[PDB]
């Protein structure tokens, strides 16, 4: 019929977001402790769900 090229709703193509970074932080011994996270790499870690991951639309 006509041309077909479009775009619609999705919020997370994978959950690699939800498959976030491993935690192998410093269990280093004494004196071997260098700086670890700089700035917002110290992530403000707080939770408010709504729907999460791929689940929630935007309006």
């Amino acid at each position: 019929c006509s041309s077909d090229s479009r775009y619609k709703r999705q919020v997370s193509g994978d959950e690699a977001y939800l498959e976030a970074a491993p935690l192998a932080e410093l269990h280093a011994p004494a004196g071997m402790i260098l700086p670890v996270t700089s700035g917002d790499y110290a992530i403000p870690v707080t939770n408010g769900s709504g729907a999460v991951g791929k689940a929630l639309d935007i309006r």
Binding site: G31, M32, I33, P35
Partner: protein
């Protein structure tokens, strides 16, 4: 292996013979940093050590290196100027 052609890759951050004479055991970090600036490697978690290590590959055998680490105390007052050539 028996490969021949080298573009002779270099890696700086060293100190000249003028530069190692600019400082002395007892100098602060800043006293070195006025004379030498900073190294392009310092000590991450240990006491203040100011690593000026040169690297270069000439030819197939042999690697040029001039390692110059400036171990201060925790106050930055210099305690050891480690002068070190290649190998």
């Amino acid at each position: 292996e028996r490969v021949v052609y080298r573009p002779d890759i270099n890696q700086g951050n060293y100190l000249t013979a003028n530069d190692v004479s600019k400082i002395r055991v007892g100098m602060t970090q800043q006293q070195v940093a006025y004379a030498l600036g900073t190294p392009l490697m310092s000590d991450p978690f240990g006491t203040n050590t100011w690593f000026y290590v040169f690297r270069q590959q000439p030819g197939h055998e042999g690697v040029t290196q001039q390692t110059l680490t400036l171990t201060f105390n925790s106050s930055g007052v210099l305690t050891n100027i480690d002068n070190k050539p290649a190998l």
